[PDB]
């Protein structure tokens, strides 16, 4: 069955987050992004490695594992590599791991909750330059840019801050190539 139904069926079973349930998760991401600064400047040098590892750990039980546009870098070996190089740390460094795994579980829920959003924006470009399954690989990519740059303390709403990067990722890809 065309993933036009395989995918769409998966996401059509995901629920939208309440206005404040979102803002709460989007904040939890920043807390699991400040705990990555701590779990990075201790185990040795910068963050992104840790972030992707925890992301894979959480991604193991995700309701939606196949996201078009995301460069899933499993590295079947690197897992136990950094997993062990973390689970064994001082008493205090275990609670920051707890914090990071949650802040990263939020980044996932937040993305899943806005998939059927990227699908309705993409649909507003049908019959044009690019096609359905194509646009989504771009919108979903903007969805990741927003969930990364987001900043509740600034005052913006996420539903909007998302649309303003989903559409932007499509109108910068409509340039083709």
């Amino acid at each position: 069955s065309d993933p036009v139904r395989q995918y769409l069926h998966e996401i059509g079973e995901v629920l939208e987050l309440d206005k404040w349930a979102e803002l709460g998760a989007a904040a939890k991401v920043e807390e699991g992004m400040e705990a990555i600064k701590k779990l990075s400047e201790a185990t040795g040098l910068d963050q992104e490695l840790i972030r992707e590892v925890v992301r894979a750990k959480i991604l193991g039980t995700a309701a939606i594992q196949k996201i078009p546009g995301l460069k899933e870098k499993p590295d079947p070996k690197t897992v136990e590599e950094v997993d062990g190089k973390l689970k064994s740390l001082p008493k205090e460094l275990k609670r920051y791991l707890h914090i990071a795994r949650e802040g990263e579980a939020a980044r996932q829920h937040l993305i899943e909750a806005n998939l059927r959003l990227v699908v309705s924006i993409a649909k507003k470009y049908t019959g044009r330059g690019l096609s359905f399954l194509d646009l989504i690989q771009e919108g979903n990519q903007g969805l990741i840019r927003a969930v990364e740059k987001f900043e509740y303390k600034r005052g913006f709403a996420f539903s909007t801050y998302a649309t303003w990067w989903i559409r932007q990722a499509i109108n910068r890809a409509i340039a083709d190539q």
Partner: antibody
């Protein structure tokens, strides 16, 4: 302090358009994060949620009928309007509007969002019948 | 479709009894659960917000408990005016879903 009153037609004909209005006092839709929502109760049945609109103009509709619902606000007149197209007898019910508290913020940045998890003040309700 | 299952659907008790209504959620809604009371020919009235907080100006016989998936309401001492239908509501996910209702009758 807070009062909401729904108003509109007691009877609309099938396939026509039902326009309900929620007039309120005791709060403003310019208040931080405040929302105003619509709930219906069919005869002899249980509450069903319809739509909600917020101070920042964010709005959400029930999936089973979002194609037929439009919600809009007039924050200077203290009113909210729900519009439902292509009605049918199955839309016969009492329609309620209700108020939703915004988060307790440190003037701007939210912190205590506890009070937002309820619709705390309801209008009296308006009985509306779709029939020929 | 997040489903809110309320039980019992109905029950009888006498003034001064202590009862517990339950609200099970198809999925985790954390603490975003509210409990209302609807008397015949009246709008619902908030009793509990955020799952366990007594709405101000509401009798202290009422209390709520739970988190995630299982919630309960509890009336310490049933009174004459406590006979009505009780509803729960989750506001974690859109659409905010309402439970099916629980009717409460008196014994005699």
């Amino acid at each position: 302090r807070i009062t909401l009153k729904e108003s509109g037609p007691p009877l609309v004909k099938p396939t026509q358009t039902l326009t309900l209005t929620c007039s309120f006092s005791g709060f403003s839709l310019s208040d931080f994060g405040v929302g105003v929502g619509w709930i219906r109760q069919p005869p002899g049945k249980a509450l069903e949620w319809l739509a909600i609109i917020y101070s920042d103009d964010d709005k959400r509709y029930s999936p089973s009928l979002n194609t037929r619902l439009t919600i809009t606000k007039d924050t200077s007149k203290n009113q909210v309007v729900l519009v439902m197209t292509r009605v049918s007898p199955v839309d016969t019910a009492t329609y309620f509007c209700a108020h939703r508290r915004g988060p307790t913020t440190l003037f701007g940045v939210p912190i205590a969002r506890g009070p937002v998890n309820a619709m705390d003040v309801w209008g009296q309700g308006i009985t509306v019948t779709i029939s020929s | 479709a997040l489903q809110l299952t309320q039980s019992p659907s109905s029950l009888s008790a006498s003034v001064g009894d202590r009862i517990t209504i339950t609200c099970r959620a198809s999925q985790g809604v954390t603490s975003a659960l509210a409990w209302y009371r609807q008397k015949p020919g009246s709008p619902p009235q908030l009793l509990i917000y955020d799952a366990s907080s007594l709405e101000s100006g509401v009798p202290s016989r009422f209390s709520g408990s739970g988190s995630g998936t299982e919630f309960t309401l509890t009336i310490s001492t049933l009174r004459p005016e406590d006979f009505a239908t009780y509803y729960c509501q989750q506001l974690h996910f859109y659409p905010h879903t309402f439970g099916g209702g629980t009717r409460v009758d008196v014994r005699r």
